[PDB]
Design a protein around this ligand. Structure first.
Ligand code: LDA
Ligand code: LDA
Ligand code: LDA
Lengths: 220, 183, 78, 86, 183, 183, 222, 183, 222, 24
């Protein structure tokens, strides 16, 4: 009774890979599918060893290991489009390493992932990352502010946003995060109340609101 | 087979079955008539079925409507009670109208009850509205918020687009294949 | 900022002329005195105080005011 | 004039329910004491009055707090309506 | 065969059948008289049928109309109740009239209930109207909004074209071929 | 044969039959006396029949008239109720008169119910009227709107041509040939 | 049992044409008739392959294909008065193509329509189209405005319209659209209240609105 | 086997089983009908089961809703009790609407009861709300707080984002494998 | 028992393609047909391998793969009118590649689509795409603003729009999106309590001055 | 009023009408 025969009718939905530790690794696309598989193993339908894996879980586990043995490495994300040959994106600016060192890193990752035959390390440009973020916000016409730091960029979006703006921001941010991860660029969405509706005010230099005739207010 | 639940309604049974099937648990529905429906599963799946029943807080409860609090028997019911029943009917009729729009699967609607004051002595406050809706897959949500706002704005005497909140979501993936039977 | 508007100007919304022309007094560089009869009138809109004398002259003719300047303060009457 | 309509109708409804309770108690007691005289075939004028008095006094000792709540509520409400326009 | 639902009305059962057939599920309707209608499906289709019953929240609740809140036969009525019965009837009459226009299949109307305040001593607010309608395929919707606005405008003492919202949609593809029976 | 509907009245039955025949569906009407009429169709046509029954929302509801909400056979009648029954009778009598004009097949009329305020202590609003009508093929609709407007204007004490809306349409193609029987 | 025997008693209502792909094409005139035929095929009364077609559906389908392979071709409509020999109207000004290219186009259309023997391409004049539109609106005495763009002309009919006017407009536009389609000329019909809602105002470059006596509002040039 | 608990309800029993299985204690549920459910365990596990029953203060108590303190049984009901039932209905209807959002598993809502004074003769205080919610694993909590605040803001007459509190949590690890039986 | 015999009576509603995967691919027009097909497979009425596909799903999948391996490629959309020979539209301005690189890209795509025999790559002009957008708005007389960025164009339509304007706008946008996709051109439709439909002016001594775009707008006092 | 400058009166008092004329 092979494992593929037990997962269901839709044979396309799952992918079975044999590992060097002689264990079957089942690759899933999402949580719902993950639990659909884990139930079969936990019930004990299959008799040999097997495990269930997905991109998010492996990203987390690998990051935890890097935290211990490479506490200063600047990197983005590991892609499993072809699970047998993952792609690891490193920064070009924030890392200075030799080719030998990179090769060693490659081999240690390969030892952590017994289902992968090799790890391809690719160098990406930070300026590109930041630029595609800011261009995506201008494309959506959101109001925003940009703040720059030595090791990261922060985009602040705040105000009395409309429902169509909240929806657009949410879709965009969620699309970007999947490609780049969350390590270099951060987005902050902050809804605030409206002081101006129904009040007169001066704006530009020397701006002030006035709550009511005879009552001036001077924001900072 | 182990008994999970007894004396369920038809509506509770079909929700429980739907939720267990989604997690690959094969369940059985039995009818006892005046005693209602019973749900059963195999032992290998018992633990999981228990954990899910707790996590989702099944079986579901009955569905609340404000008019249930104010059934009129008096000669004279308060200006509060009458107004409450009125708003509690307009809400339901709007949800039923929205469900007819193109490709909406379900929706819910809420209105600000000014009636938490009788408005004796004090001037009445303007209305606010909120709605939730679920769409078929492949719907341009951004382009479809406009229609709903336009439709609701003119159902009431004083409403501003600023005072209308609309939240939309897509249907999840379809569950078509049957769960596997324990070996 | 609590003032998320880009340019500069004054946004009146149903302002008595007294409270409107006070906002113009700093660009005029003069204190403004307004009669009660004129202070009964109202205005709404978005205004550029770029050249106050030339604005004040025009609004006098549009709103029916009359105005004078003695060197120390501007006086506006119906 | 929905305000005059409301205040006028409520005044009469309040009269009807404030007065009903004592008279209900008095009537039920009256009937039972009238019956007992028939099954006993024994007759006097005073026994029903004597019991009715006690029944009504107990009714008032019990309910009177609620009479105050109801009257204060109505008293405030009508004043606010009278002076509501300003 | 597995039982999905029992004790249905005629017009609930027909809706359930229609929705299952649209997704290629062959279903059967059985009549038990005083017990109502029963619906059955094959086992291979059971899972899918339960998923769709959840997703569409079948069987449908009955239509809600505001007069149900204010029965004609109570001992007494305040003016608010009478006024609500009145508008609750004008809505239904306009819907029944629009269904006679050329090529309209069905429609819904909503009126702003000003009745929720007296407007005594006060200027009564103007009326607002919303309508939804479904058309046969090949109808020039843009050219047909004008007719409906023109018609509704004069149905009330004071209505502005600005205060009338109209939303139109075409009919979906026709379901003519029968679903396939499981092998 | 499969049962679609039971316990229908005569007018509902003939409506359903007409709609099905238009789409090439052969249907049969059966009489059970005190149990009403039943409608049946062949299996090859069952699917389509169900889909059209849903699409048109058959069977039709009873026709609504405002006076139904304010029955005259009641102990006492407020002025609002009497003022309502008067208008709800004038509407019907105008519909019945329009049907007598040359070439008209049917009509609907609506009047602005100013009773929705008492207008005590207030000047009464002017009247507004709306009308819909269906004509025989080959009718000069453009030249026929004038007659209707002229006739309606003098039906009420104060009406302006600007306050009268009129919408006209022609009869659809005749369904004379019988549908084909399934092979 | 031939197919014509299954469509009804009114033999002249439908037209059957054989196609190169070994399929019968039943040409229909309207939606009602289209569904009358489709019910017969979908029930499975006939047993070979057959299809139902009409002019609107075919115009949509062919436009969708042109959108992919000829995304800049300027054209009006395809007429199927004679379904065996359709006529395709192209703009004389807004297209530059050689005779050879037109022939190639013809052959590809013939490949899309297996029931047609040939496609006849005719060149039409834009000035003619626009002139018939404006002459129609004048003849019907409607008030209108004309806007010109590089690629099209737009007629805006708006304001307070009487019932008679609305009826005339709807009839005319429906007539025009069936001849020329909706690609080059668009008619915008919009019922407006009084522009400013019964309020006095001054128009021109110094315009303003009187909200009330003693209350001025300065929204825009008017 | 030793008896832990008797006379439980269905929903007390399932909660007790869930909590003991989580700690690797195999338990058994028995039904006595009118006497309810009974829970039993083996002796080697008795001590532990006792300690957990104490720690979680099982069996759980019935759920509390404010409407349960102000039952509708009076001929005159005081304004304070009417407003209490009103708010106690709105809270529940909002919780039921939140559970329909995308990927929420459970929620709670609380409202500031300004009714502990009648607000007779005193200007009414503004509203405050609090919400708790639990999500599926892998949810961007930060991006989802915005949606909930937006939705709650307009469900009420006058609310500031500064006066809405929201607290979110992810679901715990799934309990799928069965506990081991004592040797 | 072939697959075509199981999908229904209307044979041409679906199309069945063999592929190098040794799996049948079923091509469907829309989601409802997609589910009508998927039910047959998921029920297990067929025994060999099969899959259901549509244009939208394939666009999404391919774009996800390109995001990994060609993260800076500027492109529009892949059309599947003829599913055996899809057409892939690239920008002429924003891409710089050699013929060899294009060939390699083509081959890799062919590897992703085992049902396709070859992929044709076509270069399109951005100026054309933008001009067709703007002219489509003018042809409907919608009020709009245009904003230009390095990599895209945004059209903003906002205010107290009328119901007929909302309808015409959403019909147009839903037609354009199908052809060009949403990557390069974006349309925002927003309803505001504002009667000038997005215009804005300041009053000064010299009269009105048009005010640049911005998030804040003056709500209607009328 | 495509050109020039004028005033659209609606039962306006002469004071508001001649005030509008004052600028010219
Ligand atoms: C409690 C007995 C005296 C109550 C007097 C109430 C007077 C109400 C006057 C208005 C009556 C007519 N109405 C209800 C149409 O206004
Ligand atoms: C025979 C006495 C009649 C008194 C009528 C008024 C009764 C209600 C008000 C007095 C209540 C007195 N109490 C119960 C508070 O002591
Ligand atoms: C002997 C009959 C006396 C009747 C009047 C008694 C005084 C009024 C009642 C005062 C108390 C009212 N209460 C119970 C609400 O406090």
């Amino acid at each position: 009774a092979e494992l593929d025969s037990l997962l269901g009718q839709e044979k396309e939905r799952f992918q079975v890979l044999p590992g060097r530790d002689k264990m079957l690794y089942v690759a899933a696309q999402n949580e719902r599918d993950t639990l659909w598989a884990r139930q079969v193993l936990a019930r004990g339908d299959y008799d040999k060893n097997a495990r269930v894996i997905n991109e998010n879980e492996e990203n987390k586990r690998i990051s935890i290991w890097l935290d211990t043995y490479y506490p200063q490495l600047a990197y983005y994300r590991i892609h499993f489009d072809e699970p047998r040959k993952p792609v690891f994106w490193l920064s070009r600016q924030r890392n200075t390493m030799s080719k030998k060192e990179l090769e060693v890193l490659s081999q240690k990752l390969r030892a952590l992932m017994p289902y992968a035959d090799s790890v391809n390390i690719t160098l990406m440009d930070d300026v590109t990352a930041a630029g595609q973020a800011e261009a995506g916000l201008k494309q959506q016409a959101l109001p925003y502010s940009r703040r720059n730091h030595k090791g990261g960029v922060t985009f602040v979006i705040q105000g009395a946003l409309d429902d169509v703006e909240i929806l657009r921001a949410r879709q965009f941010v969620d699309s970007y995060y999947r490609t780049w991860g969350g390590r270099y660029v951060q987005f902050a969405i902050e809804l605030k109340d409206d002081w101006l509706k129904g009040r007169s005010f001066q704006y530009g230099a020397e701006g002030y609101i006035k709550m009511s005739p005879g009552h001036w207010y001077f924001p900072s | 087979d182990k008994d999970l639940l007894k004396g369920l309604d038809q509506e509770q049974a079909n929700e429980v079955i739907a939720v267990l099937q989604m997690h690959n648990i094969e369940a059985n529905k039995i009818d006892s008539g005046k005693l209602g429906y019973s749900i059963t599963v195999a032992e290998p799946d018992f633990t999981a079925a228990v954990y899910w029943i707790k996590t989702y807080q099944l079986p579901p409860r009955p569905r609340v409507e404000i008019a249930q609090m104010f059934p009129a028997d008096s000669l004279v019911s308060s200006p509060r009670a009458e107004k409450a029943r009125l708003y509690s009917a307009i809400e339901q009729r709007l949800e039923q109208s929205l469900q007819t729009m193109e490709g909406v699967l379900s929706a819910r609607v809420h209105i600000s009850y000014d009636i938490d004051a009788g408005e004796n002595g004090r001037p009445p406050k303007p209305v606010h509205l909120s709605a939730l809706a679920v769409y078929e897959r492949g719907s341009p949500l951004a382009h479809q918020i406009s229609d709903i706002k336009r439709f609701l704005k003119n159902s009431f005497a004083d409403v501003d687009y600023d005072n209308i909140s609309v939240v939309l979501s897509e249907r999840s993936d379809a569950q078509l294949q049957a769960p596997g039977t324990p070996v | 900022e609590k003032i998320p508007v880009t340019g500069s100007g004054f946004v009146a919304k149903d302002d008595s002329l007294r409270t409107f022309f006070d906002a113009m007094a700093l660009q005029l560089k003069e204190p403004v005195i307004v009669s009660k009869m004129a202070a009964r009138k109202k205005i709404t809109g978005n205004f550029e105080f770029h050249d106050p004398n030339a604005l004040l002259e025009k609004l006098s003719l549009q709103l029916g005011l009359i105005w004078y300047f003695d060197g120390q303060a501007i006086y506006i009457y119906d | 004039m929905d305000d005059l309509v409301f205040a006028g109708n409520k005044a009469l409804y309040l009269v009807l329910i404030l007065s009903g309770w004592p008279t209900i108690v008095a009537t039920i007691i009256g009937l039972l004491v009238g019956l007992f005289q028939t099954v006993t075939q024994l007759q006097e004028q005073t026994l029903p009055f004597g019991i009715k008095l006690l029944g009504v006094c107990l009714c008032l000792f019990l309910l009177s707090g609620w009479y105050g709540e109801v009257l204060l509520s109505y008293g405030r409400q009508v004043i606010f309506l009278a002076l509501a326009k300003g």
